[PDB]
Amino acid sequence: TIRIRDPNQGGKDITEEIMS
Amino acid sequence: MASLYVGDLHPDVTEAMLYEKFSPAGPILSIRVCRDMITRRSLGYAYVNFQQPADAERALDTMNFDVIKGKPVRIMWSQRDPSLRKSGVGNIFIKNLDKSIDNKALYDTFSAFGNILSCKVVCDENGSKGYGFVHFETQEAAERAIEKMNGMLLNDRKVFVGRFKSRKEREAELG
RNA sequence: AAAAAAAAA
């Protein structure tokens, strides 16, 4: 559900990386 | 170990309502809503004791933040000693949470870092006030959570994540 | 801006 984006990677969605 | 604390209860939540809610997880030993001694006003929390520890775990895993009388319950394993709640060791604060984020969503995301003792998005009449707390069992889990999630965009809104600070401690540092 | 919690048996 919650979508995680990284501002220092141009706002790339990293939701799957964070979960593992 | 089969006793749950069930808090953030509406004042009018009864023992019967709690049995109806928790009963499907398995057979119940006893349920007590804690009350003021003389006025009997609910203290806003209860103990729910299952016969089987596996059943208590299922309920905690499965029924946390479910709504009773319009308010989401917050379930923990019972821990009557408040020293960890008081020390805040492992407890984190999150701010600028988009209003689309609820308790369950916050829990699911942060639990990637470690086992959570308790978490909460704060709400009022209008819903999420856009901040909350997550108390990890270990302080290493809290530290990873902060390092990883601070300054990240959560559903398109940038969050602050940092160690929780009590009101006194925070008003000290702000002056 | 924003900084929780728990008084059993």
Q: d(Cα B175, Cα B169) in Å, to the nearest integer?
A: 10
C-alpha distance from B70 to closest chain A C-alpha (Å): 23
Q: Which CATH architecture has domain B1-78?
A: 2-Layer Sandwich (3.30)
Closest-approach residue (CA) in chain B for A7: B152
Nearest to B119 by CA among B138, B108, B134, B132: B134
Structure tokens at B142: 């809290």
Query: Is any Cβ of chain A less than 8 angstroms from the Cβ of B96?
Result: no
Long-range pairs of B157-161 with CB within 8 A, sequence gap ≥ 24: B157/B96, B157/B97, B157/B98, B158/A7, B158/B96, B159/B94, B159/B95, B159/B96, B159/B97, B160/B93, B160/B94, B160/B95, B160/B96, B161/B92, B161/B93, B161/B94, B161/B95
CA angle B88, B56, B32 (to 5 degrees): 80
C-alpha distance from B101 to closest chain A C-alpha (Å): 7
Q: d(Cα B165, Cα B74) in Å, to the nearest integer?
A: 21
Smallest CA–C1' separation from B90: which nucleotide?
C4
Residues of B in contact with A20 (CB under 8 A): 112
* Alpha-carbon distances, residue A5 vs A14, A15, B82 (angstroms): 6, 7, 36
Q: Can B1-78 and B79-175 be said to share one CATH topology?
A: yes
Which amino acid appears at position B90 of this protein?
G
Name every residue whose Cβ is closer than 8 Å to that of residue B91 and which is 6 or more positions away in sequence: B85, B133, B134, B135, B136, B142, B163, B164
Task: Find out if CATH 3.30.70.330 is the number for domain B79-175.
Answer: yes
What is the residue extent of each domain of chain B?
1-78, 79-175
Query: Is any Cβ of chain A less than 8 angstroms from the Cβ of B106?
Result: yes
**A2 CB burial (10 A radius; 0-12, 13-18, 19+):** middle
